[PDB]
Design a protein around this nucleic acid. Structure first.
Ligand SMILES: Nc1ncnc2c1ncn2[C@H]1C[C@H](O)[C@@H](COP(=O)(O)NP(=O)(O)OP(=O)(O)O)O1
Ligand SMILES: [Mg+2]
Ligand SMILES: [Mg+2]
Length: 425
DNA sequence: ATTTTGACGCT
DNA sequence: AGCGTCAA
């Protein structure tokens, strides 16, 4: 009762851009706007591989990882934008720069955690407290929440349903209580409406958001009403929401760990986890995972929003599948140089922008026939931002993988260079 | 022969 | 450190 934590101490939002790379391309090229569209990498093999899909194209069944040639079978009028190629490889600079546009806007509202190229968490707890003081007990008009869904409501047209749910929620709020978690989430949603309006006004890009008490629930909430909408998941909404929620839908449970939860416990839904003691869950999944699951299935998580707006690593990667695998020393050295030149360009820009220098170079390769994605991943010192030195050092680190008694055997099917371990500069 | 990323955990 | 998991 009075000593049972409820995980309602923070207001956390997760903002995630809608079909992000597509919107970047649609801003640049108005002919792509409001069309079935996808972003592809490469072209010669099966029309290229799709990495982002507009909602209009998703209605035809087009998905990420599809070859463009097959997507065209589902959607004959599908429009395509190609990722830039530089030095023989896909180059993601346009999307990294568009991401910075969005992150810098979000950072005006609160400190952010950059969780991917297109999404960030924000801890709105302080901002909500401030806004609740500026409010002075006044009620919250539905007009301040024009794109907000309240998960679980209404209870007892889709825009009409959205407004019915919001009306039920607001009618039940105790606006007189500055410590009420539900009121805090509501003010958080007002702030997120403002943040999302600023992103769209200042970049042209639309996004969705989740508002809840922790990162996992905010991320889950965000996807409930994509695109171009935001969703509030209250603590009270958790039992019903989790009662039919597949375990794999919760962040970190979409892979082998989640599959093992399902198999070992004989359950399907997140809510079913409440029927195990913390010790039982720790016995199956480890101390850390077990405690995390015990709290998470009750809607409780403590993972903080970390104050980090910039990536911690800067990497360059290229696969050489099938016949294109690298079988000569000239080939390996040429491609290591291509990757190192892109890396040097990005590192020099990062140093000028962000007052830091990377100090370690990680080199990773895959050899043809290896079942693992990396046959070798080894580090060396990164002492100067020079592409020829970095590529020579990478070659020195990998050269003893060549079992050729000029030739490279087995052929290399992947090269990867990554700068890590930044220090102030 | 989806690829190109990038954070964090384990030992 | 090097390897693995998870997800964008
Ligand atoms: N497997 C992959 N390989 C390469 N790039 C990928 C990728 N998955 C995503 N990206 C890139 C391209 C994506 O645009 C971007 C963000 O990924 P999301 O937020 O997971 N998906 P999006 O924003 O497109 O649609 P939604 O409205 O459902 O959020 O990351
Ligand atoms: Mg997105
Ligand atoms: Mg995303």
């Amino acid at each position: 009762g009075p000593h049972m934590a409820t995980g309602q101490d923070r207001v956390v939002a997760l903002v995630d851009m809608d079909c992000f790379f597509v919107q970047v391309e649609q801003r640049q090229n108005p002919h792509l706007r409001n069309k079935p569209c996808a972003v592809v990498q490469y072209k010669s093999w099966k029309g290229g591989g799709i990495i982002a899909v507009s909602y209009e194209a998703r209605a035809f069944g087009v998905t990420r990882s599809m070859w463009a040639d097959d997507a065209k079978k589902l959607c004959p009028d599908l429009l395509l934008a190609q990722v830039r190629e530089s030095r023989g490889k896909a180059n993601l600079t346009k999307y990294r720069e568009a991401s910075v546009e969005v992150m810098e806007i979000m950072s005006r509202f609160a400190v952010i955690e950059r969780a991917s190229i297109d999404e960030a968490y924000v801890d709105l707890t302080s901002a909500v407290q401030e806004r609740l003081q500026k409010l002075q007990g006044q009620p919250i008009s539905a007009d301040l929440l024009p794109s907000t869904y309240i998960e679980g409501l209404p209870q007892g047209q889709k825009e009409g349903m959205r407004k019915q749910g919001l009306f039920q929620w607001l009618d039940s709020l105790q606006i007189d209580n500055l410590t009420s978690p539900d009121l805090q989430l509501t003010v958080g949603a007002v702030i997120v409406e403002e943040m999302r309006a600023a992103i769209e006004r200042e970049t042209g890009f639309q996004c969705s958001a989740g508002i809840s008490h922790n990162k996992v629930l905010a991320k889950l909430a965000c996807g409930l009403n994509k695109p171009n909408r935001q969703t509030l998941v209250s603590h009270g909404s958790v039992p019903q929401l989790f009662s039919q929620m597949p375990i794999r839908k919760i962040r970190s449970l979409g892979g082998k760990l989640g599959a093992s939860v399902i198999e070992i416990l004989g359950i399907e839904y997140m809510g079913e986890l409440t029927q195990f003691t913390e010790s039982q869950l720790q016995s199956h999944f480890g101390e850390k995972n077990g405690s995390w699951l015990y709290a998470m299935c009750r809607g409780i998580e403590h993972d903080p929003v970390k104050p980090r707006q910039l990536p911690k690593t800067i990497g360059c990667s290229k696969n050489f599948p099938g016949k294109t695998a690298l079988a000569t020393r000239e080939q390996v050295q040429w491609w290591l140089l291509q990757l190192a030149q892109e890396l040097e360009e990005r590192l020099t820009k990062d140093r000028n922008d962000n007052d830091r220098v990377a100090t370690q170079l990680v080199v990773s390769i895959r050899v043809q026939g290896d079942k693992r994605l990396s046959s070798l991943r080894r580090c060396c010192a990164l002492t100067r931002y020079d592409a020829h030195k970095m590529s020579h050092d990478a070659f020195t680190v990998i050269k003893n993988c060549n079992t050729s008694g000029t030739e490279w055997s087995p052929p290399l099917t992947m090269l990867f260079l990554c700068a890590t371990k930044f220090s102030a500069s």
